[PDB]
Every structure is written in C-alpha cells, then in structure tokens.
C-alpha cells in the first residue's frame, strides 16, 4: 500500500479519477 498524504485530503480529483 502507498501513502495518502494528499490522497485522503483530496475529495475531488479522487472521485474524478474514474
């Protein structure tokens, strides 16, 4: 597993990735 330093703080681009 990889770190989510910004993967967790991000709630936009994340749901936009797919």
Q: Which two tokens stand for residue 13?
A: 């681009």
User: Half-sphere exposure (CA, 13 Å, Cβ side) for 9?
Assistant: 4
Q: Cα separation of 13 and 11, whole Å?
A: 6
- Residues 12, 17, 18: CA angle, nearest 5 degrees: 120
- Residues 14, 16, 18: CA angle, nearest 5 degrees: 100
Residue whose C-alpha is closest to residue 15's, from 1, 3, 7 = 7
Structure-solving method = NMR
Q: Which position has the token pair 């770190």?
A: 3
Q: Cα separation of 8 and 14, whole Å?
A: 9
Q: Cα separation of 8 and 11, whole Å?
A: 7
15 CB neighbour count, 10 Å cutoff? 8
């Amino acid at each position: 597993f990889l770190p989510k330093l910004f993967a967790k703080i991000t709630k936009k681009n994340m749901a936009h990735i797919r």
